[PDB]
Amino acid sequence: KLVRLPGLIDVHVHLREPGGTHKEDFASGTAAALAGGITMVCAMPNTRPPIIDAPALALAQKLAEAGARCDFALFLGASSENAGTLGTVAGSAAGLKLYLNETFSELRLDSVVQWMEHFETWPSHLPIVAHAEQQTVAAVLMVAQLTQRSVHICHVARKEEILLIKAAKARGLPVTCEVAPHHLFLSHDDLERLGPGKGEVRPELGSRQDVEALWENMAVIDCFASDHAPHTLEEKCGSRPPPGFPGLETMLPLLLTAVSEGRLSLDDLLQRLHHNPRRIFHLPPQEDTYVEVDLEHEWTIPSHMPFSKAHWTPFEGQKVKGTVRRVVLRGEVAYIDGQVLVPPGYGQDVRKWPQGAVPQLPP
Amino acid sequence: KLVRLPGLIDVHVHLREPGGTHKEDFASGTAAALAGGITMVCAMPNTRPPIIDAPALALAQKLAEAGARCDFALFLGASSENAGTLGTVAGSAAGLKLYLNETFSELRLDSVVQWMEHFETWPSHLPIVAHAEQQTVAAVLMVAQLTQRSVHICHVARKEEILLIKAAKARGLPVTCEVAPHHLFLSHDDLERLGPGKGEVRPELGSRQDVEALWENMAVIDCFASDHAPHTLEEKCGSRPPPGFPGLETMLPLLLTAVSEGRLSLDDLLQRLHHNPRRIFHLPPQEDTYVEVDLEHEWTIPSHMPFSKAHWTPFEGQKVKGTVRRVVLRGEVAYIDGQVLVPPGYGQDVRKWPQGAVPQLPP
Numbered sequence: 001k002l003v004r005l006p007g008l009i010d011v012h013v014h015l016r017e018p019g020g021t022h023k024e025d026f027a028s029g030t031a032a033a034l035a036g037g038i039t040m041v042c043a044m045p046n047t048r049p050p051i052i053d054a055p056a057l058a059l060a061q062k063l064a065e066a067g068a069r070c071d072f073a074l075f076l077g078a079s080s081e082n083a084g085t086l087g088t089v090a091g092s093a094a095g096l097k098l099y100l101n102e103t104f105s106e107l108r109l110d111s112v113v114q115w116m117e118h119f120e121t122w123p124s125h126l127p128i129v130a131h132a133e134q135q136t137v138a139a140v141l142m143v144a145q146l147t148q149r150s151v152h153i154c155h156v157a158r159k160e161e162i163l164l165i166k167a168a169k170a171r172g173l174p175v176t177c178e179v180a181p182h183h184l185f186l187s188h189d190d191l192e193r194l195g196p197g198k199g200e201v202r203p204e205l206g207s208r209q210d211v212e213a214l215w216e217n218m219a220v221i222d223c224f225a226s227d228h229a230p231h232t233l234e235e236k237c238g239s240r241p242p243p244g245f246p247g248l249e250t251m252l253p254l255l256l257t258a259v260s261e262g263r264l265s266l267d268d269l270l271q272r273l274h275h276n277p278r279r280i281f282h283l284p285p286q287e288d289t290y291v292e293v294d295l296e297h298e299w300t301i302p303s304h305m306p307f308s309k310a311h312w313t314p315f316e317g318q319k320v321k322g323t324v325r326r327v328v329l330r331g332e333v334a335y336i337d338g339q340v341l342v343p344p345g346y347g348q349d350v351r352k353w354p355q356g357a358v359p360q361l362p363p
Numbered sequence: 364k365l366v367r368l369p370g371l372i373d374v375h376v377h378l379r380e381p382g383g384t385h386k387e388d389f390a391s392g393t394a395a396a397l398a399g400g401i402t403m404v405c406a407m408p409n410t411r412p413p414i415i416d417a418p419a420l421a422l423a424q425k426l427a428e429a430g431a432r433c434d435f436a437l438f439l440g441a442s443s444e445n446a447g448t449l450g451t452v453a454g455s456a457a458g459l460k461l462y463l464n465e466t467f468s469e470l471r472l473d474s475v476v477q478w479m480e481h482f483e484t485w486p487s488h489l490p491i492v493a494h495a496e497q498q499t500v501a502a503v504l505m506v507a508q509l510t511q512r513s514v515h516i517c518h519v520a521r522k523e524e525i526l527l528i529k530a531a532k533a534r535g536l537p538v539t540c541e542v543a544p545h546h547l548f549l550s551h552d553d554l555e556r557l558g559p560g561k562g563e564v565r566p567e568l569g570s571r572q573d574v575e576a577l578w579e580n581m582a583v584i585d586c587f588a589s590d591h592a593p594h595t596l597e598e599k600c601g602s603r604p605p606p607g608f609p610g611l612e613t614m615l616p617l618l619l620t621a622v623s624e625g626r627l628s629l630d631d632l633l634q635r636l637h638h639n640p641r642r643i644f645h646l647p648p649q650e651d652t653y654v655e656v657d658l659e660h661e662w663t664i665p666s667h668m669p670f671s672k673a674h675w676t677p678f679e680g681q682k683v684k685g686t687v688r689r690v691v692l693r694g695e696v697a698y699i700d701g702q703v704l705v706p707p708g709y710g711q712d713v714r715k716w717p718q719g720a721v722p723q724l725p726p
């Protein structure tokens with residue numbers, strides 16, 4: 001007996017096109033998404049060229065329309081030069097991404113004043129998300145309050161961060177957050193197995209206490225999102241390993257395993273992979289779209305999943321229970337038991353759908 | 364013709380006793396204060412042992428009462444273990460000091476949650492000051508708002524920081540700040556002369572643009588305070604130079620030079636070295652206390668000032684105009700033209716004076 005889920009949404013993926021297509025491209029990354037039960041993805045802007053201006057966004061839109069197999073929206077990235085210049089294209093993006101700490105990214109800002117300038121100039125009704133670790137979470141929350149608007153915190157990984165966000169929510173501040181599966185299912189305990197190259201990720205893997213705190217504070221977590229961050233094994237194991245884990249193909253099975261163990265409910269999962277992503281980012285429904293999962297199937301994660309060009313996974317060897325059997329996207333069979341059945345280009349930019357525009361007051 | 368000033372107050376000094384008395388002690392550091400026209404100092408807690416508990420405070424109080432030549436108050440320091448334990452002695456301290464960044468200090472905290480715990484437990488009517496650089500300023504401001512109280516930012520050094528504080532004040536937030544003379548009168552341009560050891564300080568010396576921004580935003584600066592941070596020349600020039608500059612003997616002459624050039628007024632100076640320190644820290648008046656300065660005397664700062672045991676200065680070679688001629692402290696001549704005339708032990712703990720307690724609602 002299969003369970004029918006709505007089309008799941010991952011608001012944090014790196015699809016590497018343009019410019020990093022040996023790691024992933026729209027076609028391979030959206031194949032990975034579909035195999036993971038994900039029918040809509042929001043792609044981050046730290047590509048080459050980075051998506052920090054109208055011409056880069058135009059290029060990325062065309063590459064995505066030609067290559068994506070599932071539906072998508074594309075983030076714009078904040079830079080040290082583009083505040084006040086994105087107004088005409090802002091509404092066509094998923095939102096604006098701020099990179100506020102060292103990581104795989106034309107996009108660290110030099111000064112909190114630059115953060116302020118982005119919060120002041122980006123349209124107030126459109127999403128802002130931030131890579132903001134440890135005290136940076138508190139700092140960007142302060143900027144959001146000074147500018148009287150909301151912010152969404154990406155990949156929360158630490159007890160410190162989730163408790164800060166919890167305190168902010170208790171004060172009624174408009175903040176939401178997401179958590180990635182590696183910060184729920186891996187910890188320092190796994191670094192010996194992974195090694196120092198494979199284990200590189202930002203935010204870094206946390207202690208057992210960090211992981212426990214995220215689970216204990218599940219009520220504070222608005223979304224799950226993979227931070228799918230593919231790099232090749234050669235890159236991960238080489239002399240300057242880039243941070244990041246692939247995760248689209250493993251996220252849902254890991255979380256289904258947790259559901260079957262009673263660690264969270266099916267509803268908790270659907271709030272975090274469907275309803276809350278929709279409402280935070282004003283993402284539209286997908287007609288005739290659903291995912292069928294088998295909750296009984298036990299398997300062990302292999303050394304690589306079938307679709308991502310990363311061709312490795314940090315979850316190798318973990319025992320999971322639950323698998324994606326079928327995905328239907330807008331009335332077409334998109335995935336069945338290991339086979340993707342929609343071509344590159346089937347996917348569409350949801351921000352171009354009438355129902356996918358973010359509502360705003362007449363300007 | 365001399366000008367009579369009130370007794371000036373420096374709310375940020377490191378007097379190194381207990382435990383670092385080769386660098387400075389209460390007797391030498393307060394001699395330096397008097398020679399700089401300062402009659403009251405607030406001493407930081409990063410000593411050895413650090414002033415982070417009642418027994419350490421009791422020791423420091425006695426050492427100060429025996430050694431100080433001018434009046435004083437002693438800060439307590441926040442640690443990772445003492446939140447919720449300082450309530451009985453809190454009112455006897457200048458305030459609570461938080462070290463939130465790497466510097467010469469049992470006292471960096473590991474987590475913003477620890478900052479929150481201090482803001483929640485330290486009595487709400489008593490001062491909190493923070494070493495908080497760059498985004499850390501925004502982060503600690505957020506914690507202050509979450510806990511509904513004020514904060515004072517130590518040694519603001521950058522355009523980024525002063526503009527953030529300016530924005531916070533424009534939103535009516537209860538934040539005050541101080542600036543140290545090296546961040547007004549030295550910059551990157553001086554690093555070649557100073558060298559990499561002598562030039563080490565936290566916050567580091569800023570660009571010309573940082574310095575210009577502090578001057579342009581003088582209205583945002585509530586206090587001047589030296590961050591007198593004496594270390595010996597051997598230490599500054601050795602293989603692991605500690606950060607910090609001595610500054611008590613040079614602060615007032617540097618600022619008087621600026622007054623005579625019309626860069627700020629005498630009133631601006633007195634707000635920042637007398638009235639605002641009094642009101643932010645609830646420091647009492649000193650009866651029969653004043654400083655006489657000669658605004659016409661031109662001199663060049665030598666390679667060391669007479670009193671600080673640091674026996675070096677980063678301001679060597681700077682031309683100044685203005686000198687302290689006489690200091691009277693509580694009816695006794697304390698300093699005349701290079702000679703200190705009150706003994707170690709003349710100084711008193713102002714928090715023990717009836718008028719020096721911080722007012723509070725009956726608990």
Ligand SMILES: NC(=O)N[C@@H](CC(=O)O)C(=O)O
Binds near residue numbers: 046244
């Ligand atoms: N998380 C990572 O370790 N890397 C991400 C960047 C990011 O999400 O910060 C990537 O794009 O590779």
Ligand SMILES: NC(=O)N[C@@H](CC(=O)O)C(=O)O
Binds near residue numbers: 377468565605607
């Ligand atoms: N400012 C410094 O560079 N050093 C100070 C510590 C401090 O004020 O942060 C010291 O105590 O030496």
Ligand SMILES: [Zn+2]
Binds near residue numbers: 131155203
């Ligand atoms: Zn990130």
Ligand SMILES: [Zn+2]
Binds near residue numbers: 129
């Ligand atoms: Zn994110």
Ligand SMILES: [Zn+2]
Binds near residue numbers: 012013014044229
């Ligand atoms: Zn990312």
Ligand SMILES: [Zn+2]
Binds near residue numbers: 466494
């Ligand atoms: Zn400091």
Ligand SMILES: [Zn+2]
Binds near residue numbers: 375492516518541588
């Ligand atoms: Zn200070």
Ligand SMILES: [Zn+2]
Binds near residue numbers: 375407590
């Ligand atoms: Zn200091």
